[PDB]
């Protein structure tokens, strides 16, 4: 029936952690290990603190919406969610900050020459005779067209083509290791 709580020294709060920290004192003779009626003291001490914490939480600003069935984002019109201040508890991280900051022999060249990074528009190209689109890679890429193309007009000449293909592919994948090591 009584609601308020008083303390000679007022508590401090971490309202994002739903937690409170106390600078008040205990009494050894209220909670001695040899004391039978002992946990009544913890109860009569911490009921006041959870009182003050619910008191600070229900005095918060809140959040409401107007949504409906199948709400894919969040709450609905019936939910009402309090908005908590952010934590001030500085508690450590478990892994350092993931800083992979190098340049790797192309970014430096593109900086020391006026090359701008390209626009990254589409995967597909346009075929002429026929009139399909047939992407340049991703599905039946226009690279692998000399593969099935029947007659070649002057060693089998398509095998050389695949040989050069994999030549450049492996040069790229080699320079990959070169940049990773340096």
């Amino acid at each position: 029936l009584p609601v308020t709580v008083e303390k000679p020294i007022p508590v401090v709060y971490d309202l994002g952690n739903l937690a409170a920290f106390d600078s008040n004192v205990l009494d050894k003779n209220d909670l001695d290990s040899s004391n039978a009626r002992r946990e009544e003291k913890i109860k009569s001490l911490t009921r006041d603190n959870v009182q003050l914490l619910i008191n600070q939480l229900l005095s918060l600003p809140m959040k409401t919406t107007t949504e409906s069935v199948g709400g894919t984002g969040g709450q609905s019109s019936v939910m009402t969610l309090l908005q908590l201040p952010d934590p001030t508890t500085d508690l450590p991280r478990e892994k350092p900050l993931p800083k992979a900051k190098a340049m790797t022999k192309w970014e430096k060249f593109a900086a020391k020459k006026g090359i701008k990074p390209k626009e990254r528009a589409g995967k597909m190209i346009y075929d002429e005779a026929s009139g399909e689109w047939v992407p340049k890679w991703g599905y039946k890429g226009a690279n692998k067209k000399l593969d099935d193309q029947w007659l070649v007009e002057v060693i089998d000449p398509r095998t050389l083509n695949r040989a050069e293909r994999k030549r450049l592919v492996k040069k790229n994948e080699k320079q990959q290791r070169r940049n990773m090591k340096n």
Binding site: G74, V78, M79, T80, L81
Partner: protein, 274 residues
């Protein structure tokens, strides 16, 4: 090998038993789970012979609690005494659990701000299959029709089309008012009364027809709607005498003197040269 009886790891208890899918249960138990803190609830439904079971479940660190529950055999007291496992029996069980819950929590007839907050529940199918037009989803449809709010879809109902996306309500209406059981009744009774005699034996005890059975289901829906009270059976011949009788029929263990006596008799009789 003793090493082969020693080295391996066993599944959990209810996993050695065929009762619980722990994978699906984890997919249930970790709700979202990065957004908010709203407690989850569950609607468990099981289909055996002669029993349809439906319950509302809220888990805990002790392991589980049942908030409400219904069993296919209260339907006599509202007016369903036959076919306690069909699609309409499932509809009735779900409608009963819905109305029971919404009366017991007092909807009609710390969250101090607002408000009604329609009740949320997720259907747990258990080890049951997911086949088009089943009676688990009949109980689901009945539960939702009763007034609960259960997220679900519209392809797992009797009549839905795999050809295109439509759900014919005629076949649903028949499956609610026993049109299937009654069309089967007619297709059997027009020809033979031996299969029709064995089958529908209570229906020859009470002389029921197809239109009358649709009538029974119609009346019984609003009969459930009227008073879903769930008073328990009156408990005749109670628990202490129950346990005394079960104790009488139950076997017991032994004592160390009994075991030493068995060992002595055996190794002195059949071990000393016959």
């Amino acid at each position: 090998s003793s090493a082969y009886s020693s080295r391996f790891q066993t599944p959990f208890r209810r996993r050695r038993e065929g009762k619980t899918d722990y994978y699906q249960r984890k997919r249930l138990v970790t709700q979202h789970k990065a957004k908010y803190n709203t407690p989850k609830y569950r609607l468990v439904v099981r289909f055996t012979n002669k029993d349809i079971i439906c319950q509302i479940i809220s888990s805990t660190i002790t392991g589980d609690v049942v908030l409400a529950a219904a069993y296919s055999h209260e339907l006599p007291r509202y007016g369903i005494t036959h076919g306690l496992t069909n699609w309409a029996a499932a509809y009735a069980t779900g409608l009963l659990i819905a109305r029971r819950t919404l009366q017991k929590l007092g909807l009609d007839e710390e969250a101090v701000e607002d408000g009604p907050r329609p009740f949320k529940v997720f259907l747990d199918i258990g080890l049951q299959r997911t086949t088009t037009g089943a009676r688990v989803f009949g109980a689901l449809k009945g539960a939702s029709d009763g007034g609960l709010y259960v997220p679900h879809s519209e392809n797992r109902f009797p009549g839905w089309d795999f050809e295109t996306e439509e759900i014919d309500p005629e076949l649903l209406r028949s499956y609610i008012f026993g049109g299937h059981v009654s069309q089967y009744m007619e297709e059997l009774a027009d020809d033979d009364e031996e299969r029709f005699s064995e089958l529908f034996k209570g229906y020859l005890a009470d002389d029921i027809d197809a239109d009358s059975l649709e009538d029974i289901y119609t009346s019984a829906h609003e009969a459930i709607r009227a008073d879903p009270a769930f008073k328990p059976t009156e408990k005749k011949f109670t628990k202490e005498q129950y346990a005394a009788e079960s104790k009488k029929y139950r076997q017991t263990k032994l004592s160390k003197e009994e075991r030493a006596a068995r060992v002595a008799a055996k190794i002195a009789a059949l071990a000393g040269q016959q």
